[PDB]
Amino acid sequence: SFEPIPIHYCAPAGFAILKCKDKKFNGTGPCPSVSTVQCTHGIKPVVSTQL
Amino acid sequence: QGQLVQSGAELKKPGASVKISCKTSGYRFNFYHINWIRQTAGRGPEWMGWISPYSGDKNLAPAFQDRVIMTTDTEVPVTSFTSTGAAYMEIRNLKFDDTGTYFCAKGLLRDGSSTWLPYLWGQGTLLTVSSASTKGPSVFPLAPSSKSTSGGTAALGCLVKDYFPEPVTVSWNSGALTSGVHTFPAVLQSSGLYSLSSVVTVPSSSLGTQTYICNVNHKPSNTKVDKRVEPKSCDKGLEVLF
Amino acid sequence: SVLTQSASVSGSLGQSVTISCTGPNSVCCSHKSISWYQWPPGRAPTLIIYEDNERAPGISPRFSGYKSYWSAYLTISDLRPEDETTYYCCSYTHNSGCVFGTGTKVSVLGQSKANPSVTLFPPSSEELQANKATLVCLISDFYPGAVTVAWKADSSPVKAGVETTTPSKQSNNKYAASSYLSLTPEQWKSHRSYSCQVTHEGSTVEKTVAPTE
Amino acid sequence: AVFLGFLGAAGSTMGAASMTLTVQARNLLSGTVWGIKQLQARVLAVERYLRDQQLLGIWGCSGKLICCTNVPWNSSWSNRNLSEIWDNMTWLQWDKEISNYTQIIYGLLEESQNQQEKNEQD
Amino acid sequence: AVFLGFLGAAGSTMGAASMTLTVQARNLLSGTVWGIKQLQARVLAVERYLRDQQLLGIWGCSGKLICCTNVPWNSSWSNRNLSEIWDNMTWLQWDKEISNYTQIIYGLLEESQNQQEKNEQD
Amino acid sequence: TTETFRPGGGDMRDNWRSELYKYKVVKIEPLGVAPTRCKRRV
Amino acid sequence: AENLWVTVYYGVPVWKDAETTLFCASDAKAYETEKHNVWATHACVPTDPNPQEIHLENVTEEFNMWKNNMVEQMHTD
Numbered sequence: 068s069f070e071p072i073p074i075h076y077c078a079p080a081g082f083a084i085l086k087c088k089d090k091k092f093n094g095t096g097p098c099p100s101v102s103t104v105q106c107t108h109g110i111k112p113v114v115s116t117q118l
Numbered sequence: 119q120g121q122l123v124q125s126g127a128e129l130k131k132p133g134a135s136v137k138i139s140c141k142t143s144g145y146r147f148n149f150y151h152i153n154w155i156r157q158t159a160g161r162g163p164e165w166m167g168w169i170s171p172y173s174g175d176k177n178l179a180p181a182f183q184d185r186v187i188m189t190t191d192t193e194v195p196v197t198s199f200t201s202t203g204a205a206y207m208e209i210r211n212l213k214f215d216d217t218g219t220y221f222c223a224k225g226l227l228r229d230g231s232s233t234w235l236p237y238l239w240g241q242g243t244l245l246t247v248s249s250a251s252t253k254g255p256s257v258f259p260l261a262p263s264s265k266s267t268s269g270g271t272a273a274l275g276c277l278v279k280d281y282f283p284e285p286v287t288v289s290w291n292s293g294a295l296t297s298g299v300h301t302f303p304a305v306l307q308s309s310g311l312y313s314l315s316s317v318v319t320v321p322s323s324s325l326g327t328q329t330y331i332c333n334v335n336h337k338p339s340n341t342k343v344d345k346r347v348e349p350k351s352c353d354k355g356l357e358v359l360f
Numbered sequence: 361s362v363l364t365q366s367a368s369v370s371g372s373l374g375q376s377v378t379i380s381c382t383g384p385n386s387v388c389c390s391h392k393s394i395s396w397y398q399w400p401p402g403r404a405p406t407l408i409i410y411e412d413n414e415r416a417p418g419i420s421p422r423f424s425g426y427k428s429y430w431s432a433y434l435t436i437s438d439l440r441p442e443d444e445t446t447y448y449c450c451s452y453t454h455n456s457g458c459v460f461g462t463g464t465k466v467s468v469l470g471q472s473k474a475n476p477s478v479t480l481f482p483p484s485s486e487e488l489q490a491n492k493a494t495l496v497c498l499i500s501d502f503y504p505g506a507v508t509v510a511w512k513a514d515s516s517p518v519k520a521g522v523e524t525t526t527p528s529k530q531s532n533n534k535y536a537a538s539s540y541l542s543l544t545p546e547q548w549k550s551h552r553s554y555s556c557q558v559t560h561e562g563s564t565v566e567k568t569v570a571p572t573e
Numbered sequence: 574a575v576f577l578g579f580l581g582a583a584g585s586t587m588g589a590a591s592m593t594l595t596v597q598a599r600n601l602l603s604g605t606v607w608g609i610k611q612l613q614a615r616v617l618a619v620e621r622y623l624r625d626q627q628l629l630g631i632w633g634c635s636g637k638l639i640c641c642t643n644v645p646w647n648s649s650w651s652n653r654n655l656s657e658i659w660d661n662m663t664w665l666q667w668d669k670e671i672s673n674y675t676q677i678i679y680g681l682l683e684e685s686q687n688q689q690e691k692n693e694q695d
Numbered sequence: 696a697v698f699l700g701f702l703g704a705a706g707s708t709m710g711a712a713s714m715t716l717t718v719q720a721r722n723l724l725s726g727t728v729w730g731i732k733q734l735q736a737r738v739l740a741v742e743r744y745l746r747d748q749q750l751l752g753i754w755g756c757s758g759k760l761i762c763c764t765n766v767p768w769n770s771s772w773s774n775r776n777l778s779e780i781w782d783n784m785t786w787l788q789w790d791k792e793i794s795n796y797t798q799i800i801y802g803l804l805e806e807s808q809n810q811q812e813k814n815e816q817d
Numbered sequence: 818t819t820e821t822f823r824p825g826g827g828d829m830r831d832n833w834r835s836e837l838y839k840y841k842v843v844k845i846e847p848l849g850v851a852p853t854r855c856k857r858r859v
Numbered sequence: 860a861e862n863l864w865v866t867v868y869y870g871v872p873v874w875k876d877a878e879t880t881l882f883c884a885s886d887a888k889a890y891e892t893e894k895h896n897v898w899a900t901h902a903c904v905p906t907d908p909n910p911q912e913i914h915l916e917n918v919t920e921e922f923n924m925w926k927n928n929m930v931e932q933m934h935t936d
């Protein structure tokens with residue numbers, strides 16, 4: 068099947084992934100309130116163009 | 119946390135086949151030792167010997183150094199810790215001072231200076247060393263009586279008269295009514311025959327709702343009497359309640 | 361036996377009591393250990409104290425003991441009613457066998473009595489077609505456990521065919537006994553009413569059957 | 574010398590199994606279709622080894638074998654006497670009964686070490 | 696008990712971040728296209744762990760957490776007062792400022808241990 | 818009434834189960850916590 | 860009186876039931892049946908010249924030949 072299932076990206080031991088819990092975040096620069104997480108939220112591989 | 123089974127024994131003459139067995143449950147059979155002890159009415163509680171099922175080391179008292187033989191069997195597992203074995207004892211040279219109940223009791227723990235001290239005990243097998251011949255039990259039914267007119271309590275049971283040797287078992291409804299039961303000791307008459315009584319206490323309002331079947335079982339004579347005790351009484355202090 | 365306890369001992373309720381366990385140097389207490397069992401007569405015992413002071417599994421912290429170089433002692437604090445029974449010590453080692461003592465009967469004082477509930481039974485109809493006659497005189501629910509049964513043939517003391525059990529402790533922490541009379545049906549026949557006497561602490565309770573009725 | 578062998582004291586009394594503690598630790602490490610199998614196993618070996626060694630490190634012990642700490646024995650963790658355990662039971666039996674409350678104890682033995690270190694220095 | 700969490704004290708003052716040092720060490724180890732990925736990561740984990748553990752070993756410490764040594768603080772390594780550091784700064788800030796001279800200090804903390812051992816024994 | 822037997826061998830795992838019946842696999846977990854009358858040094 | 864204290868023990872004879880990734884072993888003579896890789900071994904670790912067995916005295920364990928894993932493992936291998 069080609070169904071895009073939610074895939075999470077987790078880090079090895081001795082590594083970390085930083086989640087920017089900022090509503091009005093434009094992607095770049097100092098994110099004021101930061102949290103830390105091992106795995107990302109469920110991101111499914113929906114592949115498309117213009118949308 | 120398991121209970122050890124002890125095997126009831128025949129009355130025996132100064133010469134006859136002698137053995138008593140003992141079964142186990144709920145423990146690791148080869149760790150704990152096995153101690154034997156016998157309580158007669160003339161010399162008190164006396165320790166006989168002990169034996170370990172794993173090694174097989176028996177240490178006996180010098181009073182049984184040449185007439186008692188002890189034996190252990192092989193373990194039959196159930197789980198990784200619990201198991202089920204058995205052990206026998208044959209006491210030869212049957213004197214009359216041997217008359218009286220006797221027991222099995224296993225050790226307390228597996229190691230130490232107190233490895234074998236008997237922690238877990240058994241039920242009790244009774245001897246009667248006697249040339250006297252076996253006699254069956256005369257099971258009579260006992261009439262209920264008034265224990266309290268204001269509270270509404272009565273009592274009814276069975277009477278086991280003229281049996282030899284000890285003991286005689288008495289159950290109820292094949293094991294249904296165990297609450298309120300009181301069995302009395304047997305006295306030995308001037309002839310050689312015992313007699314005991316037994317009475318369970320049950321309420322007076324139960325007439326056609328419960329069946330009362332006293333099951334007197336005597337093993338040395340191979341007899342099982344199933345007496346039906348009548349719930350209708352003859353006391354003038356309980357008739358006020360019916 | 362070679363190990364000697366005390367004859368008996370008493371102690372009130374909510375109080376303590378001691379029991380001694382002494383003997384010669386061949387059994388106690390140099391290079392020996394002591395254990396303590398609550399052994400109700402006719403019932404299976406219960407290990408109380410092992411290795412001279414260590415309470416067996418499940419044994420309440422009320423009990424304790426101690427060993428001197430010549431005698432050991434048991435102590436039951438906050439004395440309970442059911443504790444009124446026989447108690448046995450023993451001196452053991454790792455190698456040799458264990459030898460019991462002589463026996464101590466604990467007389468817990470300060471306990472309410474109960475009047476005996478006696479009941480006498482005449483010969484049955486199947487026993488009079490046998491033909492036998494046995495008077496069954498049951499005693500129960502008395503405390504303390506000491507009663508004396510005397511029979512009288514039409515208000516005349518009989519000295520033939522007296523059956524008497526010793527008093528035994530029930531499951532409700534009382535005592536009970538059972539007497540009988542084994543005389544011919546004609547031994548009572550001439551005697552128009554037969555009784556059963558139960559003396560208890562002076563107070564005597566008696567029950568008579570009138571076999572004319 | 575007494576050398577029953579690797580795991581030889583798994584069925585003996587826990588006191589008796591304290592006598593053989595170096596043999597089990599020794600053999601724990603034991604330092605293309607088949608290749609991936611063998612290699613995978615050989616990695617999980619060092620991982621299973623370094624997890625337990627990590628714990629034995631962050632409990633301040635760091636020192637192989639028996640190690641004491643100042644944690645009180647909450648009696649509800651299968652209350653038995655000492656003679657009731659070290660003369661009677663075996664380690665499989667034991668860890669089975671204690672398995673329920675194990676994780677909590679691992680958690681407690683964490684935190685107490687750290688404070689010790691901290692104020693010990695200073 | 697105070698348990699802010701793994702890395703929870705990365706933005707707190709360095710004195711306050713000394714209070715949580717066991718949590719970060721605990722989770723550091725955390726003991727076919729996907730397979731090579733996972734396995735590679737799982738090896739680099741134990742390697743990154745054993746490098747720092749190797750250093751913490753050959754500095755004589757060996758003992759997890761705060762460890763003292765007899766190295767003098769060359770004041771040129773960002774001279775500030777103690778109250779100027781352990782009541783004010785955070786560990787990211789700190790290691791940033793000290794990052795320049797870090798390697799030299801790692802080198803010095805090597806050699807002094809060895810001589811200690813040597814003549815200590817003898 | 819009575820019963821008869823017929824050769825099978827339908828699946829190949831049983832062939833290994835013939836000689837592999839004596840063996841089982843176990844994790845070693847050498848973290849034994851216990852009580853004793855000991856306190857860590859001051 | 861005394862209060863008990865937990866003490867930590869390494870190398871305790873305690874296991875748990877599990878499965879894992881097992882690996883082969885060949886007789887030292889078998890790597891001389893070369894025949895250009897007789898089917899399995901070409902890459903397998905030799906078997907110990909001095910193998911050992913340790914009789915776990917007093918020990919009881921519950922096997923289950925049907926609920927094994929080295930059978931599923933061996934079969935897929």
Ligand SMILES: *[C@@H]1O[C@H](CO)[C@@H](O[C@@H]2O[C@H](CO)[C@@H](O[C@@H]3O[C@H](CO[C@H]4O[C@H](CO)[C@@H](O)[C@H](O[C@H]5O[C@H](CO)[C@@H](O)[C@H](O)[C@@H]5O)[C@@H]4O)[C@@H](O)[C@H](O[C@H]4O[C@H](CO)[C@@H](O)[C@H](O)[C@@H]4O)[C@@H]3O)[C@H](O)[C@H]2NC(C)=O)[C@H](O)[C@H]1NC(C)=O
Nearest residue numbers: 148149170172175177228229230231233454455585916917
């Ligand atoms: C498997 O499990 C079983 C049972 O759990 C283990 O067997 C038990 O081992 C323990 C030791 O850990 C034993 O406790 C010891 O018991 C001995 C025996 O008592 C003496 O007296 C006997 C009768 O008088 C005599 O027959 C005995 O003879 C044996 O001993 C020697 C060889 O050792 C030789 O004579 C024979 O070949 C017999 O084998 C024996 O002399 C007792 O001596 C010990 O007391 C000392 O040690 C304790 C500390 O352990 C100390 O506190 C004491 O003060 C004293 O110094 C000790 O009590 C136990 O008897 C065994 N049997 C049981 C419990 O039934 C077995 O070991 C386990 N296997 C393995 C591999 O662990």
Ligand SMILES: *[C@@H]1O[C@H](CO)[C@@H](O[C@@H]2O[C@H](CO)[C@@H](O)[C@H](O)[C@H]2NC(C)=O)[C@H](O)[C@H]1NC(C)=O
Nearest residue numbers: 194195196197198200201202921922923924925
């Ligand atoms: C293997 O054999 C054992 C005993 O030899 C079997 O276990 C007993 O099985 C009977 C019924 O077959 C039960 O009544 C017993 O209670 C069992 N004993 C125990 C300790 O569990 C077992 O079932 C057999 N299994 C197979 C697959 O042959």
Ligand SMILES: *[C@@H]1O[C@H](CO)[C@@H](O)[C@H](O)[C@H]1NC(C)=O
Nearest residue numbers: 413414415416419654655656
């Ligand atoms: C257990 O053993 C100790 C040994 O000192 C003893 O003090 C205690 O009374 C025993 N019993 C209990 C229940 O702790």
Ligand SMILES: *[C@@H]1O[C@H](CO)[C@@H](O)[C@H](O)[C@H]1NC(C)=O
Nearest residue numbers: 646647648649650677678681
């Ligand atoms: C200690 O044991 C008691 C027993 O009920 C339990 O309730 C309690 O939670 C335990 N202590 C801790 C810190 O969990």
Ligand SMILES: *[C@@H]1O[C@H](CO)[C@@H](O)[C@H](O)[C@H]1NC(C)=O
Nearest residue numbers: 650651669670671672673674
């Ligand atoms: C462990 O916990 C389970 C339930 O979680 C319980 O059934 C079991 O009895 C516990 N173990 C002991 C030894 O009580």
Ligand SMILES: *[C@@H]1O[C@H](CO)[C@@H](O)[C@H](O)[C@H]1NC(C)=O
Nearest residue numbers: 768769770771772799800803
């Ligand atoms: C100590 O600091 C001074 C400051 O300039 C520096 O020059 C010197 O090299 C340092 N010491 C060492 C051993 O490098």
Ligand SMILES: *[C@@H]1O[C@H](CO)[C@@H](O)[C@H](O)[C@H]1NC(C)=O
Nearest residue numbers: 772773791792793794795796
């Ligand atoms: C660290 O060194 C760089 C140049 O190597 C320098 O620009 C920087 O200022 C230094 N850091 C501090 C805190 O001075």
